């Protein structure tokens, strides 16, 4: 992995994680966000908090993290620490008493074309209006609002990966049944 | 502190002290680490969780011949207080903890004497497994 060593040394020689990763500042950073729900940990009706285990798949392109594979022994993909690069500052706006942003900085998958995939985990504690009128036969509509805290739409654009959250790896609950799910 | 600053400069920068390496002349030797425990207070024994919470002070004593000096050459200085991150440490941990707190709580300064003895008394709050006989 001398090829990848040289590549990683070249890509980060004069790299800035401060500036947006675009060739020209008038361009917008196009970010694809997809939420995957692994587990519905808890529904606290008294404090109106829903605790979920999630994976926040984020995909974008970094203009300055490209290379030709032929110049590096055919290396087409690498995994690098996420802390070294610029990332979108996605925040759970309706965080109740958990973390506002991602705190588990897992590795990003970088392609030679500059494409970045970053799928960090999170424990989302979200504030949900809980209607107890019909308990124990109650239905609850609980939301997770996600947005770039400091970047507006004119510099960073976020787009849903899919119209629905990813429930392919969802662990069945013994207390709730997700009747419907959708991202807007 | 011309003297203590000059002594630390002599020990760590002039002689190139490497805290990653053990204080042995050859690799096949073993470092003798003397341990004692002082129980400051027995905080509790929770039976339902079967957990013993104690406040203890672990006295570590070992020899580091790299950290020797002549007291008369350095203003009759006989003891130094140094951060523990500056010296090699015999990293002792509580093996039978039940909460993931393997290490001491407060990494206090090491006391290094001119004849090469390193004394270190970190205090710790430890939560340990204690199976309970309810008979």
């Amino acid at each position: 992995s001398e090829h990848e060593t040289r590549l990683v040394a070249k890509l980060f020689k004069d790299y800035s994680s401060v500036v947006r990763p675009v060739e020209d500042h008038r361009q917008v950073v196009e970010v694809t966000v997809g939420l995957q729900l692994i587990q519905l940990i808890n529904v606290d009706e008294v404090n109106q908090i829903v605790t979920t285990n999630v994976r926040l798949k984020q995909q974008w392109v970094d203009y300055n993290l490209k290379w030709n594979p032929d110049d590096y022994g055919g290396v087409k993909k690498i995994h690098i620490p996420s802390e070294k690069i610029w990332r979108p500052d996605l925040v759970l706006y309706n965080n109740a008493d958990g973390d506002f942003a991602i705190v588990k900085f897992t590795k990003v998958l970088l392609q030679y074309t500059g494409h970045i995939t970053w799928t960090p985990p999170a424990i989302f504690k979200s504030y949900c209006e809980i209607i107890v009128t019909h308990f124990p036969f109650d239905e609850q509509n609980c939301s997770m609002k996600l947005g770039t805290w400091t970047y507006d739409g004119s510099v960073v654009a976020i787009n849903p990966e899919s119209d629905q959250p990813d429930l392919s790896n969802f662990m069945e609950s013994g207390e709730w049944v997700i009747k419907e799910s959708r991202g807007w | 502190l011309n003297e203590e600053e000059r002594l630390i400069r002599h020990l760590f920068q002039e002689k190139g002290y490497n805290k990653e390496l053990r204080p042995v002349a050859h690799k096949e030797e073993s470092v003798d680490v003397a341990l004692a425990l002082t129980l400051s207070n027995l905080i509790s024994l929770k039976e339902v969780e079967e957990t013993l919470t104690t406040n203890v002070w672990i006295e570590h004593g070992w020899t580091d011949n790299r950290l020797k000096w002549n007291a008369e050459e350095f203003g009759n200085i006989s003891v130094l207080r140094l951060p523990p991150d500056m010296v090699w440490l015999p990293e002792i941990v509580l093996e039978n903890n039940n909460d993931g707190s393997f290490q001491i709580s407060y990494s206090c300064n090491v006391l290094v004497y001119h004849y090469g003895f390193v004394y270190w008394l970190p205090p710790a709050i430890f939560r340990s497994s204690c199976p309970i006989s309810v008979t």
């Binding site: 990848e4 060593t5 | 490497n18 390496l21």
Partner: peptide
């Protein structure tokens, strides 16, 4: 431990702990 020190210095000269060690590109 001066032999150990020299060996460690040689071992970690040019070493990158973030790069997966694959002898050749494509190796697992």
């Amino acid at each position: 431990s001066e032999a150990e020190g020299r060996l460690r210095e040689k071992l970690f000269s040019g070493y990158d702990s973030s790069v997966r060690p694959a002898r050749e590109v494509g190796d697992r």
